[PDB]
Design a protein around this ligand. Structure first.
Ligand SMILES: Cc1cc2nc3c(=O)[nH]c(=O)nc-3n(C[C@H](O)[C@H](O)[C@H](O)COP(=O)(O)O)c2cc1C
Ligand SMILES: Cc1cc2nc3c(=O)[nH]c(=O)nc-3n(C[C@H](O)[C@H](O)[C@H](O)COP(=O)(O)O)c2cc1C
Lengths: 173, 173
């Protein structure tokens, strides 16, 4: 598990290879098993493998952040029913991380694209642009997009020298 | 891994047994390996095993939420430097999920205690109460407490049938 996590690096460049149905199905199962506040499961997942839609979504932040989505084979857009609970950010973040870890176990690379609190441009929220592109009703907000694919880039694993132990406090700050 | 996650259930009743140092250490290593926005690692961790501190912290929401913490052998309070990034909520949430998963792999139970957006009572934020209790400077915000220990209650594992496929959308909402 520690070694599993040391090998998890964010991947932004992917082989031209589709994510198999069998793998996508396990990733979704992991997402649906995420602990949520009050067990309410505020999240919903939009699976995107249509190439033109992925191109559209890669522009969700015109000043950058998700451009590499254009050449990913798969994305899961994580949204949340913000009316149902006010810790939907937590809920969606936990599901996101489960998606990414399950993908890592299946030999896939992934990257989180931040949407919440990000601008599409000076006039429009990234949340708004994604809801238009995916026909999402206004009661939902978009937390993030996780792009998923077979890695086409080299990244080093973390090791124990990367661990910032100064960030651990005992019984008080 | 899906089997791993199906057996992960929140635990709020614990054996009267310390969490041994070798397991604490692996839990902290998983937390320190968590992906963060811009690699900024806005979070910090306060390990609490002092019984009196645990009692104090179990009162952080006087109307309920973390009362069981008084009977836990261990807690990790996840705080974040909220001036470092605005998505410290996400950062902290991912680290807390890594903590809970590594606790699970080591045969321990755990439970998330929500702090952000929660009140100590009608006048005081739970965040502010905890920062006073743990002497946390004001630039930090408290995300949640993870109580950790050996489980003293039985919990049914999740089923394939428990999964919410209504929450999966393909190519559009
Ligand atoms: C964001 C978040 C906040 C939570 N806050 C609390 C809490 O304050 N008190 C508590 O007893 N459980 C809390 N939980 C645990 C949930 O009750 C639990 O994860 C959910 O009911 C699913 O049940 P399970 O974890 O046993 O599978 C929280 C969970 C999440 C994801
Ligand atoms: C909350 C969060 C938001 C992120 N948003 C983006 C993003 O918008 N664009 C991007 O390219 N990477 C994003 N990342 C990945 C980060 O750049 C970060 O460096 C990475 O998670 C840490 O490096 P690593 O995953 O390779 O270990 C995000 C990560 C987190 C935790």
């Amino acid at each position: 598990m520690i070694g599993f996590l040391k090998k998890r690096r964010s991947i932004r460049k992917y082989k031209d290879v589709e994510v198999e149905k069998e793998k996508l199905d396990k990733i979704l199962k992991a997402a649906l098993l995420a602990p949520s506040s009050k067990g309410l499961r505020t999240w919903e997942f939009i699976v995107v493998d249509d190439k033109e839609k992925l191109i559209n979504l890669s522009q969700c932040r015109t000043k950058g952040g998700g451009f590499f989505l254009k050449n990913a084979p798969l994305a899961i857009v994580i949204i949340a029913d913000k009316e149902k609970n006010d810790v939907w950010i937590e809920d969606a973040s936990i599901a996101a991380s489960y998606i990414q870890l399950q993908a890592h176990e299946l030999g896939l690379g992934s990257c989180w694209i931040q949407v919440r609190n990000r601008m599409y441009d000076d006039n429009i929220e990234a949340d708004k642009y994604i809801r238009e592109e995916l026909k999402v009703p206004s009661k939902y907000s978009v937390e993030c997009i996780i792009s998923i694919g077979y890695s086409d880039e080299e990244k080093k694993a973390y090791n124990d020298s990367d661990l910032d132990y100064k960030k651990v406090h005992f019984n008080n700050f």
